[PDB]
Design a protein around this motif. Structure first.
Motif, short mmCIF file in Angstrom:
data_model
loop_
_atom_site.label_atom_id
_atom_site.label_comp_id
_atom_site.label_asym_id
_atom_site.label_seq_id
_atom_site.Cartn_x
_atom_site.Cartn_y
_atom_site.Cartn_z
N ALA A 170 19.79 73.53 17.97
CA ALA A 170 21.21 73.83 17.88
C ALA A 170 21.46 75.06 17.00
O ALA A 170 22.29 75.92 17.34
CB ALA A 170 21.97 72.63 17.34
N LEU A 171 20.86 75.07 15.82
CA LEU A 171 21.10 76.15 14.87
C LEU A 171 20.64 77.50 15.41
O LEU A 171 21.30 78.51 15.20
CB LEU A 171 20.44 75.87 13.52
CG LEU A 171 21.01 74.70 12.75
CD1 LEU A 171 20.19 74.43 11.51
CD2 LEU A 171 22.47 74.94 12.39
N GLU A 172 19.48 77.50 16.05
CA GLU A 172 18.90 78.73 16.60
C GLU A 172 19.74 79.31 17.71
O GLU A 172 19.63 80.50 18.02
CB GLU A 172 17.49 78.48 17.11
CG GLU A 172 16.48 78.29 16.00
CD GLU A 172 15.05 78.18 16.47
OE1 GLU A 172 14.78 78.38 17.69
OE2 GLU A 172 14.20 77.87 15.61
N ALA C 148 18.11 70.71 8.91
CA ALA C 148 17.33 71.73 9.57
C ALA C 148 17.69 73.12 9.05
O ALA C 148 18.74 73.31 8.43
CB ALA C 148 17.54 71.67 11.08
N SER C 149 16.79 74.06 9.32
CA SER C 149 17.07 75.49 9.28
C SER C 149 16.53 76.13 10.54
O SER C 149 15.65 75.57 11.21
CB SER C 149 16.36 76.15 8.09
OG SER C 149 16.87 75.69 6.86
N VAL C 150 16.99 77.33 10.84
CA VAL C 150 16.47 78.10 11.96
C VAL C 150 15.00 78.46 11.78
O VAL C 150 14.49 78.57 10.67
CB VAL C 150 17.29 79.39 12.23
CG1 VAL C 150 18.73 79.07 12.59
CG2 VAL C 150 17.24 80.33 11.03
N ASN C 151 14.31 78.51 12.92
CA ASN C 151 12.97 79.07 13.00
C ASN C 151 11.90 78.19 12.36
O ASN C 151 10.76 78.59 12.18
CB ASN C 151 12.94 80.49 12.44
CG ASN C 151 13.76 81.46 13.27
OD1 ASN C 151 14.23 81.14 14.35
ND2 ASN C 151 14.07 82.61 12.67
N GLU C 218 21.00 81.14 -0.25
CA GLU C 218 21.31 80.66 1.09
C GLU C 218 21.32 79.13 1.19
O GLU C 218 22.09 78.58 1.97
CB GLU C 218 20.34 81.25 2.12
CG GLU C 218 20.55 80.69 3.52
CD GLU C 218 20.13 81.66 4.60
OE1 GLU C 218 19.98 82.87 4.30
OE2 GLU C 218 19.99 81.23 5.76
N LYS C 219 20.49 78.46 0.40
CA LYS C 219 20.22 77.03 0.60
C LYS C 219 20.44 76.14 -0.63
O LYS C 219 20.61 74.94 -0.47
CB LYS C 219 18.79 76.84 1.12
CG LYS C 219 18.55 77.45 2.51
CD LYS C 219 19.34 76.72 3.59
CE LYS C 219 19.08 77.26 4.99
NZ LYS C 219 19.93 76.55 5.99
N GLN C 220 20.24 76.69 -1.82
CA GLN C 220 20.00 75.87 -3.02
C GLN C 220 21.06 76.17 -4.10
O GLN C 220 20.93 77.15 -4.82
CB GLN C 220 18.59 76.17 -3.53
CG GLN C 220 18.03 75.21 -4.58
CD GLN C 220 16.57 74.88 -4.30
OE1 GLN C 220 16.21 74.58 -3.15
NE2 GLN C 220 15.72 75.00 -5.31
CL LIG Z 1 19.58 77.94 8.86
#
Ligand SMILES: [Cl-]
Ligand SMILES: NC(=O)c1ccc[n+]([C@@H]2O[C@H](COP(=O)([O-])OP(=O)(O)OC[C@H]3O[C@@H](n4cnc5c(N)ncnc54)[C@H](O)[C@@H]3O)[C@@H](O)[C@H]2O)c1
Ligand SMILES: NC(=O)c1ccc[n+]([C@@H]2O[C@H](COP(=O)([O-])OP(=O)(O)OC[C@H]3O[C@@H](n4cnc5c(N)ncnc54)[C@H](O)[C@@H]3O)[C@@H](O)[C@H]2O)c1
Ligand SMILES: NC(=O)c1ccc[n+]([C@@H]2O[C@H](COP(=O)([O-])OP(=O)(O)OC[C@H]3O[C@@H](n4cnc5c(N)ncnc54)[C@H](O)[C@@H]3O)[C@@H](O)[C@H]2O)c1
Ligand SMILES: NC(=O)c1ccc[n+]([C@@H]2O[C@H](COP(=O)([O-])OP(=O)(O)OC[C@H]3O[C@@H](n4cnc5c(N)ncnc54)[C@H](O)[C@@H]3O)[C@@H](O)[C@H]2O)c1
Ligand SMILES: CC(C(=O)O)C(=O)O
Ligand SMILES: CC(C(=O)O)C(=O)O
Ligand SMILES: CC(C(=O)O)C(=O)O
Ligand SMILES: CC(C(=O)O)C(=O)O
Ligand SMILES: [Cl-]
Ligand SMILES: [Cl-]
Ligand SMILES: [Cl-]
Ligand code: NA
Ligand code: NA
Ligand code: NA
Ligand code: NA
Ligand code: NA
Ligand code: NA
Ligand code: NA
Ligand code: NA
Ligand code: NA
Ligand code: NA
Lengths: 260, 260, 260, 260
Positions: A170-172, C148-151, C218-220
């Motif tokens: 989904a994110l991609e 999740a994250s991309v990639n 970005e995340k933390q």
């Molecule tokens: Cl992401």
């Protein structure tokens, strides 16, 4: 209505996948079906999708535990359909045993089909959807992608993995016209579950229907099975415009299982 | 189709609730609307639900921050409709401030409307649904019922509370023909959000649309708003037979917000 | 204190696992270490665990992507230690690419190590813990076992799978004196992350430390790395009596990552 | 060790809160206790914290269902201690009834104490922690902040609200040296639970201990209670340096409840 849409449903010769293929065909989609079974039954399934619902239907046999076969299946499916708009990653198996007794080959087989095939099928489909700027990837996870039960290590691991993979997909592909979501059923009375009802009935020395009731009582507060038809309806909703901004999430049809 | 069904939508004079009422009316349901606004606009809304879609529509004014008013509203709604099949607990407000600066009266007002009204409305509706053996309670929570952002303590607390309350409602009424689920939107461009876009635009010294883009970029991977129409579609799906065994769960339409 | 306890830490020649082994040794546990690296560094690690902290330490080389090697490793570890009280399933790898470009061999390698090795190691350890009526299995998942994250398809899938497997392990061994939990770190500045910081720095044309700051931003939300020492402390807590009824759950040390 | 630290524990005259105060005092913290009970018992509690553990202890009576009383309590606590490093928001009540029978005053009382007091106490404490650049806010939620049971609408709503509020607090104060986390216990045999065990025993016509076993069997896979001492240990861990980057999260000590 999904008139003109091109759909692929893995493991659609039985159970939930068969209802997925049926509901998508009834909505107007051409459909590629897939899975094991009796050739006479499979051809009757294929031909009756066409004769009942006036769509095109194709059967492609592929053992989706094999990565290259899965990727080759998606290519062949897209060639048959003339495109690929909706992919339903549904094929799956189950095996129950405590972890220390759990067969290594069964772990491998469940990870390969229930998790890895979702990756390989997604990977093959995505470039087709990305090029056209529209797509639906609908992964059939489980309540066991969100919570656990005893004696289902491989399956719970795989299904949790599918829920994670869904989020990444989904994110991609956010904003591209492509969504990816996971349908997370509770108990549905297919052959996958009938085997567990039978094993209970033996363990407890009760008849099959008393065992079905006990199976439901343990996990599913409604005390009713989810039906394949309902789940086909959910897939049709996910494929709709109302679900354009529904992506990366789980749709639980589980009679209350995950609420408690 | 929901032909013959009797629906109530709180806070349906604006925004998401107005689209809820519209989509339910378009599906064939009679509808009670509710909320604040200009009397001329509210009566035009009511009358055009009837004249466009051929259903009955009623407006009942009630400040749902008051518990007894909320319970009295549900009674009056059920009397107007001749029953009560679908309750959409939608009315809500927002206020942003860090916790130590967060006004006590705003905490109280947000808890009262966004959480307590859902309880009181549910409590009043349930006996009507239990007697008839069918019902839908559809709570409009948020992505902020599942995750947090800064400066939204009361709202996040309330919406998490709605997600919990949804689960209880579902469990208590499992198998009775009544489901209860929470729709969890991401950003939807209503007046509730336009105020935040404006506050950003000032903070950053940018125009309103650049601010809207920044608001989306921070939280919503699709970089598109969810629409009221989409959310009305989701409510129509929840009201359908396919969703008979969907209960106690969240339906996230959030452009990927909660996937990351 | 864990005086007398017998611990095994997979992938403990670097990074988080090295700190795990150190903290367990400092608490009084004998330790089996494992992983790749320079032989001179590994022997210095082993011998200094003994000379600093007065415990026994053993190094067993095993490529835990191989199922039988993993099972044979656990046997050899338990033989070296004279038992097996605490298993830390820590070894893992990362690879970043979008799904359609993600190498099939990298998917397989990440699933094999990051997920399957946890199963095989658990399966081998459990009978030893079950016989003695005490054990800790501590799985190092990630924030990416929850979101999740991309990639990162393979890694997110694997880590979600570990979180599921953790729950099953716990349920199967509930009340037996054995717990199983997953530590879910955010960013920790090990070689696994330094590679991603470097790739960012190139992509953005910035220096390494500006890239580290961007990775955190970005995340933390804390804008600080989690440390290996902290995570070693968490494992020591999980091993304690206070955590006797902590089982089947995730312990997130992630600077706020999963709160939003 | 927490030598020199200044702690406040709400509802620390009974149950979990009493063990919290004890464990923090044993770690070296000065402690403000709070709650209802027999004055002779409360003074004995206060004085024995000092005489056993060599810290200062103060009792401040405040009905934390009142917002201003809660804010005034925190001020008085900080004045007594000479600061405020650790706040444990623990006070809570329970009432069981189906939603349509659930007393409106009980809803209000549970929301006021179990949710709103956490907000008001946090709001009052934060500026003290922000000025010194260190703090711990430890909220005692429940398994019922993550999942639901029947007949506990208000409590589940409140506790879900606490889990949301915890996340906001954490995010707003990320990187400031202040963390906020929620401890989420399963069954702990305090007076709050003894009332439910008794109600079961009557409903089922069984003795109290058979009822305790049935209560555990329904929800808690370990079939053992979580202890107040264990939970005090968890709070001591949260207060430690190892937990510097643990923020915005839940720490479940629930014997497996939320794993299934
Ligand atoms: Cl992401
Ligand atoms: N039945 C339930 O209660 C339930 C609950 C949650 C999720 N699920 C999931 O629903 C999905 C469908 O399950 P079902 O209950 O309909 O089971 P089913 O056994 O009726 O159907 C399985 C389908 O997959 C096919 N299949 C099996 N191995 C395959 C392979 N190697 N390659 C290609 N096809 C293969 C079968 O031929 C069949 O068409 C599965 O992913 C399952 O995990 C089922
Ligand atoms: N807009 C978003 O991005 C978004 C995202 C997630 C969830 N939500 C939720 O969606 C729901 C609807 O919000 P919206 O964005 O359409 O906002 P809106 O401001 O457009 O509409 C709010 C509606 O509630 C009514 N209302 C307000 N106070 C009331 C009271 N005391 N009694 C009765 N009615 C009252 C208003 O008159 C109006 O009809 C809310 O629960 C909100 O929390 C909104
Ligand atoms: N660093 C982070 O930010 C972070 C965040 C969340 C989770 N994790 C997880 O923490 C764990 C440790 O990661 P790290 O950051 O310390 O990485 P690292 O690269 O420093 O250490 C990896 C360790 O695993 C060993 N290893 C790799 N392949 C192996 C194999 N086939 N067999 C046996 N050992 C093998 C390596 O030799 C090394 O000892 C991993 O499971 C990782 O997924 C890391
Ligand atoms: N016991 C369990 O199984 C369990 C499980 C999960 C969470 N919890 C939570 O643990 C916390 C402590 O509960 P417990 O089981 O120790 O209960 P308890 O009844 O033993 O203790 C409650 C404490 O709160 C105090 N209190 C009650 N009303 C108050 C008010 N208005 N103002 C100030 N103090 C007040 C009481 O005097 C007492 O000190 C509660 O938040 C509860 O929700 C309990
Ligand atoms: C419920 C069912 C499934 O998840 O497939 C089961 O086998 O557990
Ligand atoms: C996204 C929006 C909502 O949750 O209502 C907001 O105000 O945060
Ligand atoms: C945060 C880090 C991890 O999960 O290992 C990453 O590589 O994403
Ligand atoms: C378990 C217990 C609690 O959450 O306080 C209960 O009363 O449900
Ligand atoms: Cl189970
Ligand atoms: Cl935020
Ligand atoms: Cl329940
Ligand atoms: Na098409
Ligand atoms: Na495969
Ligand atoms: Na009707
Ligand atoms: Na109210
Ligand atoms: Na998140
Ligand atoms: Na030992
Ligand atoms: Na392996
Ligand atoms: Na101090
Ligand atoms: Na209060
Ligand atoms: Na659960």
């Amino acid at each position: 209505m999904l008139k003109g849409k091109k759909a692929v449903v893995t493991g659609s010769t039985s159970g939930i996948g068969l209802a997925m293929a049926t509901e998508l065909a009834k909505a107007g989609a051409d459909v590629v079906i897939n899975g094991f079974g009796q050739p006479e039954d499979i051809e009757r399934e294929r031909s009756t999708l066409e004769s009942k619902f006036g769509v095109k239907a194709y059967y492609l046999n592929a053992d989706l535990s094999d990565a290259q076969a899965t990727r080759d299946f998606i290519a062949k499916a897209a060639e048959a359909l003339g495109g690929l708009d909706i992919l339903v990653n549904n094929a799956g198996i189950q095996h129950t045993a405590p972890i220390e007794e759990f067969p290594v080959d069964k772990w491998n087989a469940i990870i390969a089909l229930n998790l890895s095939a979702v990756f390989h099928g997604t990977a093959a489909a995505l470039p087709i959807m990305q090029k056209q700027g529209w797509g639906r990837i609908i992964n059939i996870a489980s309540a066991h992608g969100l919570v656990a039960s005893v004696n289902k290590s491989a399956y719970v691991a795989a299904k949790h993995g599918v829920v994670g993979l869904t989020k990444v997909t989904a994110l991609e592909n956010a904003g591209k016209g492509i969504t990816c979501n996971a349908i997370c059923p509770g108990w549905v009375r297919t052959p996958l579950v009938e085997k567990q009802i039978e094993a209970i009935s033996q363990q407890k020395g009760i008849d099959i229907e008393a065992a079905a009731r006990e199976l439901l009582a343990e996990k599913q507060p409604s005390l009713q099975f989810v039906t394949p038809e309902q789940l086909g309806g959910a897939a049709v909703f996910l494929s709709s415009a109302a679900a354009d901004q529904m992506t990366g999430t789980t749709l639980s049809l589980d009679g209350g299982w995950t609420a408690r």
